[PDB]
């Protein structure tokens, strides 16, 4: 009977919640009460990257921490030299509606995806001096909200059909399909060892997927609104979920539950973009009120504020060496805040 | 200048990319984007054939003006998470079937699509170009049964002049922003041929009024 299957799911939901309450002896806010705070963190705009002509929807640094690709809705995908502010590449796309972009960890490939239900991978380092479409990965039945390169052969895309998928690039095909969400998967993020990844959907829940196995390991039902963005703690044993109810929340995978809440009463608009700094002490959130807050991650209190954007900061990313922070907003400007 | 021989030529590649970014951005700034948002499958496929993967852009050109019509109804996701990409669109081409009032109700479902899109926080200034399709099929549905099936609070008689003027006023009622935006109503069907000419007349009133906010005249 169907009415017994809702029941034994709830009695299994109880023992998850009972074992969640069994392990909460003290919160992370209780341990970091006597710890030196990081003070005011004031970061000046070093570079301001011009040249875009529409709303910037995503960026992604390279592993070399000097190149960043940046998609925008004018149908362009510019690759920047972040030190001396040159455009290395300007890749004209097949459609303007691009909602995410990626950068392969080797540097040879760049994938952008958007409202076309498609993920198109570009080839940077090649003969003929072109940036041509290496592959176009079709099979999603919704807008492709985030794509992240595992390596040069595999890419994990998150679409709005309540499904993440793992692609093979050398033959465009869904290797494993990561089902289990009940809402549009708004943003994913990969673990540093890339055996696991998290994906925060529009059902107030992020998950923890085993990449090689295909299943969902844990379900982190802590929020109350749409999880617009997500990022990993650099240890890989914790993550942070920027929501639409203006609360970043730091979970962790070993304790299976929520640790903190980065809530302030002066903010009411949600978070478009979360990225930890290197060493994971700061938690740079990206809000809709033209702002970026640099939250401490051991204490909850706000350390600094990155103000200077004229529209919604839609994307931010700290470099792999932790030197800079590039927040690309809805006005056609990226800003690099060392 | 303290730049090397390669760093001098990496800046010149950037400044040649900047030339191709402005010359392709000014080409796309002279184009009119029109988010076509016909509710359901009623009347939406008629006016794309009259004027000439999830999102189906239908490019066409009338009187040296290039229109882009982003038929986006084949997405079937949550609408609030990607409708802000269409912020800054010139207009919105809504499509209502006039004859679906007998076919909750289908006409009332297309009012909830209109009410949720005309008071959206992104489209507070994009003028809806409302197309009431199926007019030559709306006349015989009226003469077989009055409007009183769909609309309970109907005071006028059954005939087509009072019914079609009522459904025009029911959709021009759902906007609360009477000062920032306008609703250009047409009464079309499959046999009409002016429906490419009406869009050019309706977007040229939009871009004129959008230009008169820029110079401070309005």
């Amino acid at each position: 009977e169907l009415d017994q299957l809702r029941q034994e799911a709830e009695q299994l939901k109880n023992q998850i919640r009972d074992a969640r309450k069994a392990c909460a002896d003290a919160t992370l806010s209780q341990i970091t009460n006597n710890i030196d705070p990081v003070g005011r963190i004031q970061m000046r705009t070093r570079r301001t990257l011009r040249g875009h002509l529409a709303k910037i929807y995503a960026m992604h640094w390279g592993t070399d921490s000097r190149l960043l690709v940046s998609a925008s809705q004018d149908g362009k995908l510019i690759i920047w030299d972040s030190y001396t502010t040159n455009k290395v590449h300007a890749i004209p796309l097949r459609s303007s509606w691009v909602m995410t972009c990626a950068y392969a960890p080797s540097g040879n490939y760049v994938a952008c995806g958007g409202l076309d239900n498609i993920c198109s991978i570009y080839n940077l380092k090649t003969r003929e001096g072109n940036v041509r479409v290496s592959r176009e990965l079709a099979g999603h039945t919704g807008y492709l909200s985030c794509c992240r390169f595992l390596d040069d052969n595999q890419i994990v895309t998150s679409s709005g059909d309540t499904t993440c998928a793992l692609w093979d690039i050398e033959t465009g095909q869904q290797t494993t399909t990561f089902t289990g969400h009940t809402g549009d998967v708004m943003s994913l993020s990969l673990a540093p060892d890339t055996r696991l990844f998290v994906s925060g959907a529009c059902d107030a829940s992020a998950k923890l997927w085993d990449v090689r196995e295909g299943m969902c390991r844990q379900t982190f039902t802590g929020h109350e609104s749409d999880i617009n963005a997500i990022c990993f703690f650099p240890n890989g044993n914790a993550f942070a979920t920027g929501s639409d109810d203006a609360t970043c929340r730091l979970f962790d995978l070993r304790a299976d539950q929520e640790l903190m809440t980065y809530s302030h009463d002066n903010i009411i608009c949600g978070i478009t973009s979360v990225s930890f700094s290197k060493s994971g002490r700061l938690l740079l959130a990206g809000y809709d009120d033209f702002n970026c807050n640099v939250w401490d991650a051991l204490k909850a209190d706000r350390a600094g504020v990155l103000a200077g954007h004229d529209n919604r900061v839609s994307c931010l990313g700290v470099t792999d060496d932790g030197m800079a922070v590039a927040t690309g907003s809805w006005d056609s400007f990226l800003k690099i805040w060392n | 200048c303290t730049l090397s021989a390669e760093d001098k030529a990496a800046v010149e590649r950037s400044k040649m990319i900047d030339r191709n970014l402005r010359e392709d951005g000014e080409k796309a700034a002279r184009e009119v984007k029109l988010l076509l948002l016909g509710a359901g499958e009623s009347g939406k496929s008629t006016i794309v054939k009259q004027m000439k993967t999830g999102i189906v852009e239908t490019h066409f050109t009338f009187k040296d003006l290039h229109f882009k019509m982003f038929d986006v109804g084949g997405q079937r996701s949550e609408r609030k998470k990607w409708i802000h990409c269409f912020e800054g669109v010139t207009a919105i081409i809504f499509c209502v079937a006039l004859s679906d009032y007998d076919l909750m109700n289908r006409m009332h479902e297309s009012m909830k699509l209109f009410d949720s899109i005309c008071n959206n926080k992104w489209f507070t200034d994009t003028s809806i170009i409302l197309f009431l399709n199926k007019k030559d099929l709306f006349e015989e549905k009226i003469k077989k049964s009055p409007l009183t099936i769909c609309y309970p609070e109907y005071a006028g008689s059954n005939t087509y002049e009072e019914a079609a003027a009522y459904i025009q006023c029911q959709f021009e009622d759902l906007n609360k922003r009477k000062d920032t935006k306008e609703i250009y109503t047409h009464f079309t069907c499959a046999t009409d041929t002016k429906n490419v000419q009406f869009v050019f007349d309706a977007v040229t009133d939009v871009i004129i009024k959008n230009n008169l906010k820029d110079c401070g005249l309005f």
């Epitope: 190149l67 | 090397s4 390669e6 760093d7 030529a9 990496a10 590649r13």
Partner: single-chain antibody, 232 residues
């Protein structure tokens, strides 16, 4: 990708000739193309350069005001109009693409070359070994020495290592030093001291029998080193 040129032959001394390099197989309008000549018994010397979109144009000291470089981006061809050809212009003119961005490999593909034959402050590189006696399989080392420190302020050291197999055009091996051209084996590696440089070949083979040229790229004119010929 290929670059085939045309022109040359017996020219009267003091005449004129147009050298035409027709580029087929790559995006020609984004490559800042060079012209590099080679005397009949000497090493390379750089002749002319035109950018992408014909922005900047440089020449050597010998051909400034005497030659003229020009490119045709729609027709995908590159020209070199030379007037008053002296008897020191008898050479074989290569046609070298070179794109410049961050992490690019300039000078990567070279044209085949057309034997022209007329009738009858620069960073002075010095490859001291004119010829190295070579047994196959051993580890050989080609040493190049600059006359100005090529290490720029931005960390890059603009020295390029070319190999010209006997009967072929110079192939790029190593761009800005200890890099590697995409397509050459792992056995090549270049470890330099900012002003004195070294090429290391580990497991030598008969495909590496040739002449090795070290080329600066710090400033124009691009002075090539002399020949380091490796013989079995």
């Amino acid at each position: 990708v290929q670059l085939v040129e045309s022109g040359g032959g017996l020219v009267q001394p003091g005449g004129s000739r147009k050298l035409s390099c027709s580029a087929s197989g790559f995006a020609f309008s984004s490559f800042g193309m060079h012209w590099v000549r080679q005397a009949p018994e000497k090493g390379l010397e750089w002749v002319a350069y035109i950018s992408s979109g014909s922005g900047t144009i440089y020449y050597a000291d010998t051909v400034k005001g005497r030659f003229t470089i020009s490119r045709d981006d729609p027709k995908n061809t590159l020209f070199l109009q030379m007037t008053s050809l002296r008897s020191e212009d008898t050479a074989m003119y290569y046609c070298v693409r070179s794109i410049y961005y961050y992490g690019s490999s300039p000078f990567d593909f070279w044209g085949q070359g057309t034997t022209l034959t007329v009738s009858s402050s620069d960073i002075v590189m010095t490859q001291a070994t004119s010829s190295v006696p070579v047994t196959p399989g051993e580890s050989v080392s080609i040493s190049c020495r600059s006359s100005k420190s090529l290490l720029h302020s931005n960390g890059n050291t603009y020295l390029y290592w070319f190999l010209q197999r006997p009967g072929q055009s110079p192939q790029l091996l190593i761009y800005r030093m200890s890099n590697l051209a995409s397509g050459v084996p792992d056995r090549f590696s270049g470890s330099g001291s900012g002003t004195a440089f070294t090429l290391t070949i580990s497991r030598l083979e008969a495909e590496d029998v040739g002449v090795y040229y070290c080329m600066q790229h710090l400033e124009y004119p691009l002075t090539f080193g002399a020949g380091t010929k490796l013989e079995l």
